[PDB]
Design a protein around this ligand. Structure first.
Ligand SMILES: O=P(O)(O)OC[C@H]1O[C@H](OP(=O)(O)OP(=O)(O)O)[C@H](O)[C@@H]1O
Ligand SMILES: O=P(O)(O)OC[C@H]1O[C@H](OP(=O)(O)OP(=O)(O)O)[C@H](O)[C@@H]1O
Ligand SMILES: O=P(O)(O)OC[C@H]1O[C@H](OP(=O)(O)OP(=O)(O)O)[C@H](O)[C@@H]1O
Ligand SMILES: O=P(O)(O)OC[C@H]1O[C@H](OP(=O)(O)OP(=O)(O)O)[C@H](O)[C@@H]1O
Ligand SMILES: O=P(O)(O)OC[C@H]1O[C@H](OP(=O)(O)OP(=O)(O)O)[C@H](O)[C@@H]1O
Ligand SMILES: O=P(O)(O)OC[C@H]1O[C@H](OP(=O)(O)OP(=O)(O)O)[C@H](O)[C@@H]1O
Ligand SMILES: [Mg+2]
Ligand SMILES: [Mg+2]
Ligand SMILES: [Mg+2]
Ligand SMILES: [Mg+2]
Ligand SMILES: [Mg+2]
Ligand SMILES: [Mg+2]
Ligand SMILES: [Mg+2]
Ligand SMILES: [Mg+2]
Ligand SMILES: [Mg+2]
Ligand SMILES: [Mg+2]
Ligand SMILES: [Mg+2]
Ligand SMILES: [Mg+2]
Lengths: 309, 309, 309, 309, 309, 309
């Protein structure tokens, strides 16, 4: 069985980068829409007995991309692929992970069920919003971390990183920032709202680094940056693995006081970078390519949790 | 257990009509989008131990409506509804029912699987494109027919209906037109392409009635009407249960020679009727309401196959 | 994993031919009946870690053959075969594919479910009655076509095939005859009943070729041939992939006006050819052997759709 | 929900008796064969929201009856019956319950899986060959015992029953005969082969009563009776819940030395009683009717294990 | 269908209290061990057609209690109970909800799968460690909150509760304490370690109230109380819904500086209260009884989230 | 894929022996308990793409061992092992294989379901209490026999084995002793209770050999030995594949009249052999190692049924 890399419509640049780092060409697939807005998927090459990897991120027009992904998975499954893996850098509906005193659907579980019934045997994703989403599946799920690439960017871009601070925008981000701080050996502050917020950890004359999993409307990071500047921090950085940047996000970032908003390219950012000069992008295509290659060859994937390939 | 009728965003008028004919109010549900194009569903009333019916048609923005439908089904299922029924007047991806020498997905089967895994116990649909789609499910599926309402419209709108002709636009429509002709006791012609088409059945000075399950781009009915006028038919009618009317459909119908294009309101048509004066709408909300009420009360549903309620 | 070919009792000649074209011996299996009409299956050789193919056609005593097939599949599955494929040249209950205004079971879906629960991982079949039956399974199904062999027979047996006609006995056979006509570049007529039938397409002094998927009682092809001779066609041919030939079929064919009734050997025909001199048999064992070999080696199976091996 | 009793073709007399004892008419169902030996099932009445019980015994042409039963179950399930129960007085393939050093299928497990996937929610059966077959299902299975009716027959037919003996034909029948002996307060002998057999338990001048679950070829009971007459027993009785009586059974019983071979009517015996004057039949239709009625009303079914209704 | 309440061995007092508040007697069940440490479960009364609720908490000898619970669920399911609900006040293995850079099992998902395959249709639990565990099931899960009873205890036991503080022992407890503070309208502090910890929120001369979901070894609450006394708080309270109190917990609490450690009786505490004078118990049996009664009657269960019954 | 052998806590000696005979080291796994009696499992090496075999016997603290086994299976399954096999020398809850007129759970079926849902693809076990337990699974189950090793021990330890007797303690053990006798060509006696028991088969001055599948409380073998000494047998032997030896077993064996109680090491016996001088142990680790190696290499496993490796 050989590796076949297929791209959805959501993130073609990421898929091309991944295929480049594996020494492959993207698989021949036509993904369009009929006139009635129905997804049309045609696998243009035989995938019989192959190790198929479909790259599709939960971004853009989310329901359309998810439908395309499910249809591609099912097409490869009934075309007798030996194994079908969904490479989903940003997991759709990941924030619908709990009910919490509401008659709300756990939409992430529904997405996991639909991926399972489409025929996915393996999920590769990056920085799941909640790790418990791994339990929503009955198939193996590899949850990669952008932390190696984030630390690399911090070291090569913040000259004052030995005295800097790693700040979480909310309580739920504590573990990630603590890990980052430990690997950098730096002090780590915290922030949480009460319309007011409290920041704990000395930041005066010290660079603050907000680290968080995603920014959708950027209310969280903007409030955090406001408070960080209240406490007299010199410069403020925001680092995110998923730059959804929906709605008022670009205007808020433009009107905010960040020195940089760094995001990983799990979501295409070219358009967002057009209208916001302070957005920078970390390439994580090497981590995804390495994970695909290690799952194919049966090598350890947890090695990546601590090493940049 | 009491009937609860919930509407999706796709066809709110149809749901309101159905709820009216059942003497009910639509269930309290909020269906919106987050900023990142993610479906948000909130059931505003308890459905515990109730007989929930969700009305949503595979029209408009199809993937968005299907995702909303699945999310609503799952929300009602994990909110402890006794039974959840998906009322899907136009089944999405119904035309993806077969592979036919292509590495194509059978998307209709995938939709059936997703409806099953969301937790639907019953499907009510109208004029499935292929009856074999009933076999795609492991739950009961009630496939209603618009034929009663179609015959009623023909009798009350075509004064020459005793001498008229019932014509199929393609080979695959033969059974429906034969049934219509038998119930009307009329001659039935046929049409099939060869860029040329052949029409069999005397139509000169006789009204032709094209009857078909759906019109998406209206190429089929337009070519059929062209040939019918070649054979000297006096007036031409098109009757359809699903008026998708996507892409060039409205321009083609406006430039065509139909005396009327009649469709059933399984899909909202107000916007299409705005730009096409020859589209008429048959109400089928009574058939849907009667089917919902008969499934709830345990009465025979196959009774509707031959009787207008 | 090596190929293991096992034969059921239904079609031993076809299985022997397939094993010959693969350079193999039929697997050692004892398939008998106990005194109480219960199927006894004993695999006489280890199938552990092997690629098992069971050849059994939905013919003869259909329920007995289907039970034998399911029992063999389950026996090979719990004997730790790596993969079990059911090679079913004529699919049993394929005509029970829809409900259609009746409280009828979709027996084809039930057969698919039973094949899945017995443990089949792959289905190879020839000319399914409805392509939507592929959607009845959640495993891959390869639906081979007899069209290559049919065209070969037509070219090597009908000297007037460049001016001939390809006729469908009913509406539902349109696609197959159109494909045959296109590959032969000939005119294609059509036939459908109204006790009367209408034939469209010039056939005078031209050979008519009825092409259809199966003949059970041969009422369809006999009525079609009657009408074709009404329209003054010189000679009439019937070509079928499945020659069930049950009940009054042999008498009807003997009393009919066919120049030949050609069938493919998906069903044993020796006994039927004994009592009907006009039945000819096309060997399709090469297509089945090639499909088995290509699924085993991971080569493209859709290649066969257009090429005789 | 009301009780609906449907009969298969296998045992129409038993179904009529059961329906009589419930004060019902048999449900309107047409069960025939097409010309190609395919089972045709048509439910002639609505079963929507009803409590359907299908009576079909694993006798006669076993695969045909099992296919008819599965098709009826599936038909009632997709016709929206509230609950479908398979009343299977003699379970087909029950003797294929284990592998035992052979590459043999556990056909009973396959039958259980097929009954589950057809949609059966409940199984009612009588004197399963192995009680572990109850574990083959994931649905509830009620395994009734003929012991009450057997004791009633013994008391009303063997005037010497207080001094009689209850003998098992093999080792595997020990539990049943011990229970019978305990409820009668009699001595219980045993028999097992070594071509020779040994009988333990004084039987001279005492009536021996062979008790066993089934007689297929009657080799077991005939050898047991031979040995019992070797040990000087006065008269020999055989009592069985399932009289399959296949192959040489009738000749063996006619040439044997039984005073009576008593069987319960889980299998039709009219034809067998025609050619064997020593076969008597115990009616167990009251136990089946009582079990159906108690499962419908939610009353205790285990009550029947000790009481004749 | 009537309510049947069955008790496991884990928490018999809680089950008796629940049955008292429902006006019922505990169902007749024998739960013992064979000599080989195997769980023996015998339902002593018919549960056919009943609404069975099994009360068993993930406490004590956890694997033994979980096995007993699964065996009871399966026993009631194959005894034809209409519906089986597992009332699990403390969910076993709830802390194994994620992998987090380790080759660790998500044991909570495994427990959910085993509960589903045993046949549970409904789960009632109290204060799940992670709300995402609700997504581990495909059946409805009601996750009750002890917050109403906790607020009642605070108001009736801390006379200074209008000026008090609600403190979280770690970051992951933020939401619960914020909700408690909002319903009390009090300031809410926070605590998190760095061997050092930082407390944010003025506590001098103010009572601190640690609120957390569980205390296993009481390291978390003991460190939090140490820091709270470092910041000069007058008195310190710990409130917990699950008092596991394993290992060194009792010694730590005895050597700590709590004014009270309040726990809810989801776990039996009589033995722990024997050796620790500062443990108090909040009865939550009324919430569990009300939830059972509301699920049985189809009334709203989410009503309890805000109201003490 | 390479063989990985993992040991549970139940039988570490057996796992080490098996790993020795395969030329491997035991896989690196930490299996402990948290303070709250919760199983903690950590796979210390990557199992990605490997053939994992977990050795764990249903002995000792049975529920704890079973939970550890399920947790290990699930851990290896979601760690992307190619195939996971549970090597279960003594199957837990195997004696709960039937209901038999009681509202008892079929706990063996529940254990099979839990093993399946944890993700086991293959079961290797030795001398299942009932062979029908193989039907409780839908995955392949290899049921090895200790008979080869038992015959080897008998021949090398009982000098009078050509004139000896093979005795079954109950009726249900008949098949095993008959097979042993046939392979030894010896007379075979039988024993069954009536507080009295009857022994059939001449044993005077002849060594009796009780052969049975397990001894839990040793009541069965002790009563059998008492009767055998009543019939004047010279010496009495008991041979068992599973020496559970729970409760009063050791005292009964010490007070009994066995010349030897031989057991196979499917359960650790060091502690039991400490307090009972007449217990001897047959090593069966070679059979288990050979079965593991043959399933890995795809060689015939049924070969072992008749040959000592
Ligand atoms: O739309 P924005 O203002 O950019 O906010 C996006 C936030 O949503 C998520 O947090 P969530 O609110 O789910 O809290 P949690 O991380 O504690 O679950 C995520 O951690 C971001 O912080
Ligand atoms: O987009 P339009 O030009 O309006 O055509 C829509 C057609 O699609 C379907 O037919 P299909 O082509 O699937 O053939 P079938 O009905 O024979 O399956 C349907 O019956 C309509 O005739
Ligand atoms: O028993 P016979 O007279 O030989 O007829 C057999 C016919 O049955 C099938 O057609 P069907 O009637 O199912 O129509 P369809 O092909 O349009 O579905 C098949 O296409 C044959 O034409
Ligand atoms: O065909 P016949 O000669 O009438 O024999 C039928 C026998 O088959 C069954 O026993 P089986 O041989 O399965 O042994 P068991 O009851 O110990 O499993 C049953 O108990 C009958 O005794
Ligand atoms: O054994 P103890 O010292 O009493 O600690 C028990 C802690 O475990 C859980 O927290 P966890 O460590 O899982 O963190 P989380 O709540 O943030 O997930 C829980 O919230 C308790 O605080
Ligand atoms: O606890 P002990 O006194 O050692 O008895 C253990 C007995 O249990 C099993 O027999 P069972 O009673 O299940 O009868 P069966 O073998 O006929 O099923 C097994 O065959 C042993 O003989
Ligand atoms: Mg969140
Ligand atoms: Mg957050
Ligand atoms: Mg079509
Ligand atoms: Mg059409
Ligand atoms: Mg047809
Ligand atoms: Mg046809
Ligand atoms: Mg038997
Ligand atoms: Mg027997
Ligand atoms: Mg935690
Ligand atoms: Mg915590
Ligand atoms: Mg037993
Ligand atoms: Mg025994």
């Amino acid at each position: 069985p050989n590796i076949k890399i297929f791209s959805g419509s959501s993130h073609q640049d990421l898929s091309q980068k991944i295929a480049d780092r594996l020494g492959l060409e993207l698989g021949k697939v036509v993904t369009k829409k009929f006139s009635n807005q129905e997804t049309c998927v045609e696998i243009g090459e035989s995938v019989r007995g192959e190790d198929v990897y479909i790259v599709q991120s939960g971004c853009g027009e989310i329901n359309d991309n998810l439908m395309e992904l499910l249809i591609m998975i099912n097409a490869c499954k009934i075309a007798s692929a030996s194994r079908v893996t969904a490479v989903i850098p940003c997991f759709p509906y990941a924030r619908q992970d709990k009910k919490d005193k509401s008659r709300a659907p756990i939409s992430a579980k529904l997405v996991a069920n639909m991926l399972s019934v489409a025929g996915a045997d393996h999920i590769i994703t990056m920085d799941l919003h909640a790790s418990q989403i791994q339990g929503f599946f009955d198939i193996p799920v590899d949850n990669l971390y952008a932390e190696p690439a984030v630390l690399k960017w911090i070291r090569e871009n913040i000259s004052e990183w030995r005295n800097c601070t790693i700040v979480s925008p909310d309580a739920g981000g504590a573990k990630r920032v603590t890990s980052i701080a430990d690997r950098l050996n730096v002090d780590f502050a915290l922030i949480h709202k009460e319309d007011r917020m409290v920041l704990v950890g000395d930041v005066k004359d010290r660079v603050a680094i907000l680290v968080d999993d995603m920014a959708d409307t950027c209310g969280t990071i903007c409030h955090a940056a406001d408070k960080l500047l209240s406490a007299g921090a010199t410069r403020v950085y925001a680092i995110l693995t998923h730059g959804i940047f929906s709605g008022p996000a670009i205007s808020r970032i433009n009107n905010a006081c960040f020195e940089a908003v760094v995001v990983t390219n799990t979501i295409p950012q070219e358009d967002k970078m057009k209208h916001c000069s302070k957005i920078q992008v970390i390439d994580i295509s090497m981590i995804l390519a390495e994970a695909i290659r290690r799952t194919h060859n049966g090598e350890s994937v947890s090695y990546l949790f601590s090493h940049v390939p």
